[PDB]
Amino acid sequence: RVAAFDLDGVLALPSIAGAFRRSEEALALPRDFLLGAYQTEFPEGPTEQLMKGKITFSQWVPLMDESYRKSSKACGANLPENFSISQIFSQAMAARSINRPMLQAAIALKKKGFTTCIVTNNWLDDGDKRDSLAQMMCELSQHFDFLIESCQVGMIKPEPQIYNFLLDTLKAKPNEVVFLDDFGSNLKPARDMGMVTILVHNTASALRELEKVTGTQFPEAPLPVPCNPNDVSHGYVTVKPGIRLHFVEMGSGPALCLCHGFPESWFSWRYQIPALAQAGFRVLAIDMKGYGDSSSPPEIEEYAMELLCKEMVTFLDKLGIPQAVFIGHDWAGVMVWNMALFYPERVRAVASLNTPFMPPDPDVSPMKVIRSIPVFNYQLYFQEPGVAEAELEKNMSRTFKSFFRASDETGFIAVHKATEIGGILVNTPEDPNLSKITTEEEIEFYIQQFKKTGFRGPLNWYRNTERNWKWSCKGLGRKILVPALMVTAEKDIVLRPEMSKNMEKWIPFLKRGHIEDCGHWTQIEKPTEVNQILIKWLQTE
Amino acid sequence: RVAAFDLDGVLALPSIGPTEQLMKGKITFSQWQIFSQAMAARSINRPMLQAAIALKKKGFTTCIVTNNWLDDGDKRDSLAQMMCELSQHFDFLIESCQVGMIKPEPQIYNFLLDTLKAKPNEVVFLDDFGSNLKPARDMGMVTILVHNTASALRELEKVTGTQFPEAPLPVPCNPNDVSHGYVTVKPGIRLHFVEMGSGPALCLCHGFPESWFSWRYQIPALAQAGFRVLAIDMKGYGDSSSPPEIEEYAMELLCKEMVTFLDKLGIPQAVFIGHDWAGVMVWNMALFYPERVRAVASLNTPFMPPDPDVSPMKVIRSIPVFNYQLYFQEPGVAEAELEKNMSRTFKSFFRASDETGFIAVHKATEIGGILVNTPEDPNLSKITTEEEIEFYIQQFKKTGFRGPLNWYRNTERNWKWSCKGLGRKILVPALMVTAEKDIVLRPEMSKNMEKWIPFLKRGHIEDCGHWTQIEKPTEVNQILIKWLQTE
Ligand SMILES: O=C(NCCCc1ccccc1)NC1CCCCC1
């Protein structure tokens, strides 16, 4: 089966026609005097040349102005002398946006396993606000398998060639497909052809229910679009001889590098990658040193924080970027605050999820502070090479089902006990019921990803306690003045909100966010909220 | 032997207790007035940077050791950009505010050497304060003082090493010191590219028989001009897919695969700049997808829409200087010729407008070979370097020439397709740059362009052949930027 939706009216709102009305009436003219040129059944003259893409938009402006003027005062209704459908058109088109519960509805049946597509009487917009159309088309691009623009194939609606063509392409029966239009007039030949006829009047809503009817039912407030994965661009920068950083790119300027934590990947930002791009940013979801597709040198000094933060600038340098908004989480969160602290120039901004900014005490061995905190026992476990590796690597499937679990779920990790029992996955089963937070596929990704690096490299992040301490002690007399945002997770066992109360001592103006009922895996666990926040922040500052 | 420079006022001009350490790095900026503008209002010293890349290219160890500071300022980015840019030309960056030891504290000099790993006589220090050069000469270093805006300066420079020009070529990005993108637009098909700079986007599209490396001279500059550059490897070339089938290189297919490329990358609009064959594609991009095109620029290639009542083929058969195009028309043949010895093949193709050893564009069929007239070991063009050539060899050693040649082999359908937009006009911003001495693709072939593209802005480079970019880069840049800036 397949679903195909018209853009203006069903996937995109408010229909361009809408404004055609409030311009007709607005300009006091005979019902459909203007919507005539647009949709009427007998497309002739200029607009027929338009949807067929014989002439572009700007051309069609004059041709149509004058053609209106014919039927104008020179045939009933008084159309002003100095009148033009150009600015009313481009503005109503620019002022039109995506029908989420619809696009949402579309992504569903695609997930369900449907043939998702759009069939619209399009045109080639060479206008000033020609971009608006491009963005709407850029982002809609993913969700649909096929795009049949009247202005590309040369057969406007409701001429049958298009419908008869919509099928040859979809290679299917007309009953096999369902047609969503907002004119009904374009729907007549669709029904008559043995296809499903659903008039998208309203704003979906009801057409969403007489829609639920066949196929299935759709969410109430679904999950934000997660970039997923072969469909993405893959960057590769070589910052130093043996060392190269892999990453994923989406969206256009300005730049914001998403840095992940232990034991994850760039795929962790899957839910934020798209949205943020769409938020109007060039996203760079990077695979941190030692992870997935970037270099994983075995040596430990190789993961010193000083080294990673510097290798971070080298990364921007080679890419030719002078400044980025750094958004860290978990371990990276640390790095990220360090980025802000040591390279403010290259940092347009900083955001940390869960990780507070915890500068060291000069008169307190770094090690002792770990030995003291009871919930950092695992950190000590890790401290020894070969050991934790051996445990985590043994059966990667469990290892992840174990680590990634919600705040309200059993099958946990032994952050407290670790050392005694000799593991974190020592009291965990050998078949952890898969978290309601991940999918077997999502898990499998991480497996393959780690099947390439093992865990040494990632673990070595922990193993630099001392020098990391020695280094960061250099900025104890500094303040973090570039824009910062700290987001805390209510139920994150290690890395608890409480660990940040004294943050403003160093980071005044530090703006803040807080997600409730949320565990460690902030992004994967409460994405929509993570997004809302991150965007608002980016927009606002 | 190595060389050091001091940002403070040597690689960047106009020159610029509690400061005794802001520099050492204990305190930041705002951790402190009208001095920020001063920093902003300052920039790179091109002959110095030039001089530097010279020595770097001469096989020296290039570096900067400066009394820095950390900027949490508002005009912070200015510093980034300068630093972002200088970065590629220096090996080590010894910034006071980083290793904690301002100049002239002798620890820095001691450290620059331990870092550099060499004798103090093996290096030459370039400071503009001289009071910072005492210890340097003291240590047994080579001290040059930056008094003039770098004249008698880089003069004493030329002395110690050798001669750097005055009006030089613009810095050429490379080689693998660049980012490498990879997008998979369709099952077997993926497009490789190179990225530099931050927004907005401009995709540089190359011609036959080249690569993204062809834009080497424009890639940096343009980034620095304030743009996110995407020097792409066209279908069939270098690191992107090279499917053997011909239909696979139809123009309609490439222009569409072009939108797919922007889509996956999440970009809604780009400025498309084409040259040679791509130039064609690029104008088609403008013609079929104006939405995704913020702009269009073509180098050499005019916009030549087809005649409905004139078989496309006949127009090639008619023009005498498109004989080679006919040669190419047959599969296996031209491949076999060009592939045989790639070294010659490129030395032959890439030559200036004022050089012999040419290509048989005219008599290709007749002599049966676009190289038959070409020497056997073409004296390497003064326009390329053995290394630059070698790049292209390896690049093509991966795809052969079928894929690239198939660009030619779609004459008919390309015609049939483009005939769809004969009733259209190109209204998005366009710029046509013509090359005086480009044998095929002569300026003359564009006089009627505005018939279709009014407002079409224009540029023209003199004494220039086909390889516009490689041949007259600085002029190409000047123009492309001015255009981008202005529109
Ligand atoms: O796996 C981790 N890893 C945390 C590293 C935290 C950290 C990073 C940097 C400095 C101090 C602490 N945390 C989760 C595991 C599942 C239960 C709750 C904590």
Ligand SMILES: O=C(NCCCc1ccccc1)NC1CCCCC1
């Ligand atoms: O290699 C080429 N290739 C040109 C393809 C030109 C073209 C492509 C599409 C439409 C019209 C013309 N040109 C050089 C060859 C060596 C001598 C100068 C021209």
